[PDB]
Design a protein around this ligand. Structure first.
Ligand SMILES: Cc1ncc(C[n+]2csc(CCOP(=O)(O)OP(=O)(O)O)c2C)c(N)n1
Ligand SMILES: Cc1ncc(C[n+]2csc(CCOP(=O)(O)OP(=O)(O)O)c2C)c(N)n1
Ligand SMILES: *C(CC(C)C)C(=O)O
Ligand SMILES: *C(CC(C)C)C(=O)O
Ligand SMILES: [Mg+2]
Ligand SMILES: [Mg+2]
Lengths: 338, 407, 338, 407
């Protein structure tokens, strides 16, 4: 059957499905056990499957990822969490130097079928260590697979799919979209998921193929490359600018769906990249570099990108940093200009 | 056949909601039972101390043992003032958090004695590297309540210009190092600050802080390592309040062990002190400040206390531990115990207690009102948006200039 | 006066000058003390200035950077080393979460005038953890300053300049160029520095301004954006292709000299980016994204980039990975094509 | 005035080139003096053991004490064979390194007993997480010399297909986990492997390794923490050969302390054993294997040895320590001491020693010749260039396919 869930509830369902589908699936991290997670994403999972399957861990990122790597070497499928993406740094070495290169350097003898869930994104008065977007620290790592959903349905499918993949997967989860969609309007109080599209999630097993982007708003004017919270910001911003922009939610940052992208810009003739992360060397720099390579001639204007400023995430100036429907919309016009 | 299946061990607290915590796991000792070593003691001779408890004030409020020596009542009164001021400011700010005038706040209920006690045993020039729960230090060093509150509101008067989350203070003038949301990092940095002082032939020392949970963080180990290797003039404080959000200290590695004992293993003189015994906190801190300033090396102090309130304004203790927990904690309330002792020795009274309480309340309400006059979350009155691109680098590099104009 | 030195000797001179010029300058890291460094870069420095100025440190990257941050907070100017750039990961958190944001989050109260020297680059049969180029992990960090020299003279000036800068500086040092220049030809045994241009280094104090790139080979055909070992690879590759390509050695990865670059491509009309680092989300992706923004119309062809493959650095297949005069040269033609 | 200038402390070795090292810093104990605890002993009761030395073979080659019990001569002969085979292969490969047939090599001179001894006390299915200096394990598990050498040459026959640096072996079939150039990381991963085994109700255990220098690495602490918290079935081995490249173990935090003592502080049963006493290495390893397999928890073992040769083929010991150092090391040569004891008890002879030596030399020369037939550094005969884009991911993602064709 089907039930209406929030992203939190969706992700929880995915783990519940896998924990039940694969005896080798394990879940653990800070406060993930008895408490059920600081975001409720793992509620009751320990009560239902036991301490040996879902449990609390010491405050050590490197230790969490490290033991998980050794666990995978044995033959387990570890789904581990990092309370906030802002706190993945301590696990940098284990992630880059170990998890990613495990299969390569061992010629397949040992593998890292691990999944690391990390809440990310801003727009919640989180501050410097409560709302950054480190996707660019991962996608440049040969051996990793970076994924980020934008709605309940996709959140479950991509997690179940990310979990089963035999490659290490960095599963980014936009905390901003945990309770409901967010377009970037703080004036208009936000609504839940039960009153919006894509909150209908199947109770059992199902997936959402990786390496496959998705068009959110079919358009012919401009190609909009994005993911996460800026997906709903591009949709609304397009409606405000009037621009018949095509909104593309990559879903899979890297590897990504190079065709669905080169195909939308091929038709359109212009694209704009939108992501929360800082600008310089952000993920948006790779998207731009690929578009300019497979769509140089069919390009009818300079490729634009609306992202966060090259500054640490502020608290007070929240709305001045976050690329909202406004600053984004302005971009949808600057590109449609001759 | 021969070997039974191996099994995973996951530590659990004795008390969960709807139960009563059995605080036996605490390796407590009676007042005066622990000896007071010379400040030149060798690290290894501190082994027994690392698994005991330094405590002065007994059940009746009487001072016992060697740690009771040379204790000026005037320092205790400043202590009480500091503890009361911290708890009252804490209460007030939670309310302001609820009435949405503020974005986020963290209390230090039950831990007010630790930071205030050590602050008073050090010099203002001694730099502290605190976590987010040592506001008691700022109070002991009489920092402006108006400036603290402004930062908690991100006003146009926020000394941090809105760039940081509420309670992530920074007060160099009061030897209070800029707080970071990343756990443990300040512990190692404090050792560097001490190394810097020794390198310059100075006499200033560092005061590092970290909670039980964060001890599992890599920088905890790094701090002990460098502290020992270079004999750094730093006091390494571990505040064991039994919890780290929803996780009981056992999951931090506290089962059958102590955090002080980890200092002994890394060649550092260590002390496990009653964190809710102000006299004990001032005495042990003074002891460590002296060892360091004399160039006798670092010290590691485990403060045994209890996190009385929620982890923060976003937490709910009822979902993982007994709500009646603090009521049974064998070490009680720091403010209540100093009050009992202070009165019994003739240097405090029920009258002074209430009067002093009434003035900090007024001081806080006035400060809050004074600070609000510069903005709130409602009032869009906050730091400029152009100040947002400042200080990323000493001089605003071209790319930022561009981004500023583009705003 | 002046003396002929290798990069190793140049860098050593810079530290010798600063250690003597600023009482607040300190040098330390693994084997940096008595031994003088695994690359000899700090030889005799401890004997001349004492243990308190130059000393050996425990094998802890995070501890090395962390204590340095605290040192800067006190008021010292720490010049610290990381034996190999491949091993900076353990210090990720301290670098990103602390060092970079120190000035910002404290509103100037505390500063991190630190310098982190890290040998980088391949082409020496180093392997996966002996020759990577992590520049892209730093340049995307708001608050850092990434620098990389290409010859003795520049090596000293940029170090002395990097040291004095009040911003945290990640000083990358190409180990491949430590003993002498390298064009990418392993057949032709390599020569020292005393038999090549730019080995004349002043004995005393002097600097080489940051944020200022440098043209290595004036050209009108194509703009070549590079740094490090690929500088000498672009020069030779240009001579083999015959292409009158203009070789630009950024010297300062980020912040970079946006003008000297936009100005060479403005004239030329085409540019090619060359760096050892893997491709996807490498630094070359930002260079490409900026060129496409300030030089869209004056662009007479798709911007090309010759970099390392998206794979961990191999040992045996060394010469098949490293972007040598050949694979690069091929690029200088592909762009000059109609 | 009152306080004298603080000063930085930088530990230095007693012996530098042109001097003689005073090995007094080693907290040594005579053979048989240390007791042999029950495998269920509590961590805390191992405190004294963490600061002593477990040693069997005395000055005369006689076995003393409780650790001498139940020791089959056949295991020692396999041991000797393993130690001789490791040292002979080591010598041969350095030569091949000089004659540029090879790119890089690392010896284990003087440490051959540690890894070979523990390997023999474990089961092949027990997974080891070695650093780059435990080749003795591969030898004890009779791994193909031809395949090892091919990897050291990056031949077309290199099992790692040239993707890894020489000596960065990987032999899952022999319970030898893929080596990484990043120090300490394997220590924590080994704990995870053990946690995995306990989670699955298995009976296999993990054998983790790390040198004195790397103990200062964050993952060392993380390993002890998780090992203790979950009571993981892992043997945590610390090989203290007194050096880490050019740095004396004191700079790693070894001054006035021991590495075993760090296990005690983190709630782990610890043992400080003579690393050049094979009998002691087999006995202590067997002891720890049993504690773990019985589900009695992890164990931490500090092996006191000495790095007899250069750090690697790129190092020069003469620039930082006495060249005559190993000659004065109180614990001598593992191969020489087992030889003396083995002969004295009637299970080895000068004749067997030489004969066995001669066969490993032939075996190595033949293996080298056999391996070279598949390539060298000279012979461009190496793995394909297209195999270079394989295994980065389970399935070659599009971008790599492109890069492959573009070659
Ligand atoms: C590196 C890192 N990981 C995780 C977090 C999220 N976190 C914030 S506070 C906290 C609890 C730490 O507890 P403890 O050290 O006991 O301090 P207390 O909250 O009790 O004062 C955690 C896990 C963080 N801030 N930084
Ligand atoms: C994270 C990291 N930092 C630095 C290095 C460079 N390095 C390689 S081996 C080594 C010495 C480590 O010594 P020890 O742990 O004592 O082991 P040993 O060489 O004595 O067996 C160092 C510093 C590295 N490989 N990884
Ligand atoms: C956020 C900020 C502070 C540490 C409470 C968090 O990680 O909890
Ligand atoms: C390189 C490889 C191995 C660890 C010797 C190094 O870092 O020394
Ligand atoms: Mg705590
Ligand atoms: Mg060693």
């Amino acid at each position: 059957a089907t039930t209406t869930m929030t992203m939190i509830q969706a992700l929880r369902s995915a783990m519940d499905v896998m924990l039940e589908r694969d005896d080798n699936v394990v879940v653990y991290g800070q406060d993930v056990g008895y408490f059920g997670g600081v975001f409720r994403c793992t509620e009751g999972l320990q009560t239902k499957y036991g301490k040996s399957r879902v449990f609390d861990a010491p405050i050590s990122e490197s230790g969490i990822v490290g033991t998980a790597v050794g666990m995978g070497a044995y033959g387990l499928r570890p789904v581990v969490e990092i309370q906030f993406a802002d706190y993945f740094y301590p696990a940098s070495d284990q992630i880059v130097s170990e998890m990613a290169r495990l299969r390569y350097r061992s010629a397949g003898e040992f593998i890292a079928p691990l999944t690391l869930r990390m809440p990310c994104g801003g727009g919640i008065y989180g501050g410097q260590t409560h709302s950054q977007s480190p996707e660019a620290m991962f996608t440049q790592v040969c051996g990793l697979r970076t994924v980020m959903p934008s709605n309940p349905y996709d959140a479950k499918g991509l997690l179940i799919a990310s979990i089963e993949c035999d490659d290490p997967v960095i599963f980014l989860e936009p905390k901003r979209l945990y309770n409901g969609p967010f377009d970037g309007h703080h004036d208009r109080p936000v609504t839940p998921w039960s009153k919006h599209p894509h909150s209908a999630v199947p109770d059992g097993y199902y997936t959402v193929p990786l390496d496959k982007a998705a068009i959110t708003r079919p358009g012919n004017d401009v190609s909009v490359l994005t993911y996460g919270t800026t997906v709903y910001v591009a949709q609304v911003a397009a409606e405000e600018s009037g621009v018949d922009a095509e909104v593309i939610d990559l879903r899979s940052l890297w590897p990504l769906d190079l065709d669905t992208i080169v195909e939308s810009v091929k038709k359109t003739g212009r694209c704009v990249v939108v992501h929360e992360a800082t600008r310089t060397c952000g993920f948006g720099a790779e998207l731009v570099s690929l578009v300019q390579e497979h769509c140089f001639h069919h390009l009818e204007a300079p490729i634009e990108r609306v992202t966060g400023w090259d500054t640490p995430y502020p608290h007070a100036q929240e709305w001045a940093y976050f690329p909202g429907p406004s600053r984004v919309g302005a971009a949808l016009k600057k590109v449609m200009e001759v | 056949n021969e070997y039974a299946p191996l099994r995973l061990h996951v530590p659990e607290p004795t008390g969960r909601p709807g139960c009563q915590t059995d605080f036996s796991y605490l390796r407590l000792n009676d007042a005066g039972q622990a000896r007071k070593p010379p400040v030149d003691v060798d690290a290894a001779d501190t082994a027994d101390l690392s698994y005991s408890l330094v405590r002065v004030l007994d059940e009746q409020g009487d001072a016992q043992g060697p740690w009771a020596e040379d204790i000026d009542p005037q320092i205790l009164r400043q202590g009480m003032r500091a503890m009361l001021k911290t708890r009252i400011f804490d209460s007030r700010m939670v309310v302001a958090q609820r009435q949405k005038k503020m974005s986020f706040y963290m209390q230090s209920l039950g831990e007010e004695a630790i930071g205030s006690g050590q602050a008073l045993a050090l010099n203002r020039t001694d730099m502290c590297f605190p976590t987010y729960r040592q506001q008691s230090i700022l109070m002991a060093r009489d920092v402006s309540l108006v400036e603290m509150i402004c930062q908690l509101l991100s006003n146009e008067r926020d000394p941090l210009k809105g760039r940081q989350l509420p309670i992530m203070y920074s007060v160099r003038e009061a030897g209070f190092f800029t707080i970071s949301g990343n756990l443990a990092t300040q512990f190692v940095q404090a050792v560097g600050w001490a190394m810097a002082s020794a390198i310059k032939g100075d006499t200033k020392i560092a005061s590092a802080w970290i909670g039980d949970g964060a001890t599992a963080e890599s920088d905890f180990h790094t701090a002990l390592t460098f502290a020992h290797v270079y004999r750094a003039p730093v006091i390494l404080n571990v505040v064991n309040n039994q919890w780290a959000i929803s996780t009981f200290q056992a999951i931090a590695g506290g089962e059958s062990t102590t955090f002080a004992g980890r200092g002994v293993g890394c060649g550092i003189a260590s002390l496990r002190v009653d964190g809710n015994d102000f006299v004990a906190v001032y005495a042990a801190s003074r002891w460590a400040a002296e060892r360091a300033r004399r160039g006798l090396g670092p010290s590691l102090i485990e403060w045994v206390t209890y996190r009385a309130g929620p982890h923060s304004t976003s937490d709910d203790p009822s979902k993982y531990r007994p709500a009646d927990d603090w009521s049974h904690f064998p070490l009680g309330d720091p403010i209540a115990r100093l009050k009992q002792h202070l009165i019994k020795i003739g240097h405090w009274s029920e009258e002074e207690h209430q009067a002093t309480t009434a003035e900090f309340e007024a001081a806080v309400i006035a400060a809050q009102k004074e600070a609000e006059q510069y903005g709130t979350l409602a009032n869009g009155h906050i730091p400029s948006a152009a100040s947002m691109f400042e200080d990323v680098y000493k001089e605003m590099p071209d790319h930022l200039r561009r981004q500023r104009q583009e705003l």
